[PDB]
From a paper:
Heterotrimeric (αβγ) laminins are a major constituent of all basement membranes. A major function of laminins is to form cell-associated polymers, which provide structural support as well as platforms for signalling. The three short arms of the laminin heterotrimer are composed of long repeats of laminin-type epidermal growth factor-like (LE) domains, capped by laminin N-terminal (LN) domains that mediate the self-interaction of laminins. The LE repeats are interrupted once (β and γ chains) or twice (α chains) by globular domains of unknown function.
The β2 LE5-LF-LE6 structure was solved by the multiple isomorphous replacement method and refined to Rfree = 0.210 at 1.85 Å resolution. The asymmetric unit of the monoclinic crystals contains two structurally very similar copies of β2 LE5-LF-LE6 (r.m.s. deviation of 0.62 Å for 301 Cα atoms). The β2 LE5-LF-LE6 fragment has a surprisingly compact structure with approximate dimensions of 60 Å × 50 Å × 40 Å. The 220 residues inserted between LE5 and LE6 are folded into two distinct regions, a 10-stranded β-sandwich (residues 564–726) and an α-helical region (727–783). The Ca2 + ion is coordinated by the side chains of Glu573 (monodentate), Glu575 (bidentate) and Asp719 (monodentate), as well as the carbonyl oxygen atoms of residues 598, 601 and 719; the resulting coordination geometry is a pentagonal bipyramid. The α-helical region of the LF domain consists of three helices held together by a disulphide bond, Cys752–Cys768, and a substantial hydrophobic core (Val727, Leu730, Met732, Phe733, Phe747, Leu771, Leu772, Ala775, Val779) that is conserved in other LF domains. Helix α3 plays an important role in mediating the apparently stable association of the LF domain with LE5: α3 residues Ser774 and Ser776 interact with loop a of LE5 (residues 528–531), and Gly782 and Val783 interact with loop c of LE5 (residues 547–550). A search for related structures using PDBeFold revealed that the β-sandwich of the LF domain is related to the family 35 carbohydrate binding module (CBM35) structure, despite pairwise sequence identities of just over 10%; the α-helical region of the LF domain has no counterpart in CBM35 or any other protein. An unexpected feature of the laminin β2 LE5-LF-LE6 structure is the relative arrangement of LE5 and LE6, which closely resembles the canonical arrangement of LE domains that are not separated by an inserted domain. Thus, the LF domain is inserted into the short arm of laminin β chains without interrupting the regular array of LE domains.
Numbering used by the authors: 523 to 704, 714 to 833
């Protein structure tokens, strides 16, 4: 009997008529709006990734890396950028899904043993934050954040999140002020991970919210976002990420598989990977693998 619509996938908490159908956000389906529509996907917590090697600004050395039969690369894009003391990388960030806090993850790889580094991140906005926006509380101190890279890691979560808004273009500047050990550092990318625990499905006061919050933290579901590799999560994480993603993105996103590079318009509904032709890479199968050429109907060749 009970409605029990999806807290994330449906608009109202109760069903209509005697069909038991809920009102769904865009491209969520099922009687309770609990399923992603074929042709659409729920994004991974690290969907919003900007490659260091795609960055504008001062000329920096690109360090390419080849995929080996080992599979499971530890980087994305062609590889990395080598950043030395005093140099800066500019990430041009646009098209964010929602006005909320994002945690900043810097993915990197050291060049000497026991390597540490000191960094400064500055958020540059296209105007003053408005009093009526969810980011209206932001002040200048909130938009400059220091971070330290520690030995034996490949990702840093900066110690404070940033509040960013949809429909706007930002420039996030990353400066390396010092690095040593006992040729600089390699930077892979910057990831903007939505801080989904602030959503009411978790942060609310009701018993149902407290349970979701407890489960999310116990199984550390937020770790999906840390690295390119995706190791299977506890099954308990799955419906929580489906619901949280629907609330961030307003339902599910269209796959947008590249017509030439993909075998199909239909991508994986968890994370959105398209099925690539030989020699093709990228979520949308829209680039040649490194060392391959000739993007077209057949794929790419070495
Ligand atoms: Ca990269
Ligand atoms: Cl993408």
């Amino acid at each position: 009997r009970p409605c029990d619509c999806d807290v994330g996938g449906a608009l109202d908490p109760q069903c209509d008529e005697a069909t038991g159908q809920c009102r769904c956000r865009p491209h969520m389906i099922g009687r309770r709006c609990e399923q992603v529509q074929p042709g659409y996907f729920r994004p991974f917590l690290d969907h919003l990734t900007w490659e260091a090697e795609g960055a504008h600004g001062q000329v920096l050395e690109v360090v390419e890396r080849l995929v080996t039969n080992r599979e499971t690369p530890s980087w994305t894009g062609v590889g990395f950028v080598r950043l030395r003391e005093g140099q800066e990388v500019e990430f041009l960030v646009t098209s964010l899904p929602r006005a909320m806090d994002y945690d900043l993850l810097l993915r990197w790889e050291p060049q000497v043993p026991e390597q540490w580094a000191e960094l400064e991140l500055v958020v540059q906005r296209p105007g003053p934050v408005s009093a009526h926006s969810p980011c209206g509380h932001v002040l200048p101190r909130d938009d400059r954040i220091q971070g330290m890279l520690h030995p034996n890691t490949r990702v840093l979560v900066f110690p404070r999140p940033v509040c960013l808004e949809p429909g706007l273009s930002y420039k996030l500047k990353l400066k390396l002020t010092g690095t040593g050990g006992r040729s600089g550092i390699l930077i892979d990318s910057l990831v903007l991970q939505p801080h989904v625990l602030m959503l009411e499905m978790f942060s609310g006061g009701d018993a149902a919210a407290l349970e979701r919050r407890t489960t999310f933290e116990r199984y550390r579901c937020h770790e999906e976002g840390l690295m390119p590799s995706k190791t299977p999560l506890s099954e308990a994480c799955v419906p929580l990420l489906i619901s949280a993603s629907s609330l961030v993105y307003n339902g599910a996103l269209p796959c947008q598989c590249d017509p030439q590079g993909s075998l199909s318009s239909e991508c994986n509904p968890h994370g959105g990977q398209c099925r690539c032709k030989p020699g093709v890479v990228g979520r949308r199968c829209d680039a040649c693998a490194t060392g391959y050429y000739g993007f077209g109907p057949a794929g790419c060749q070495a």
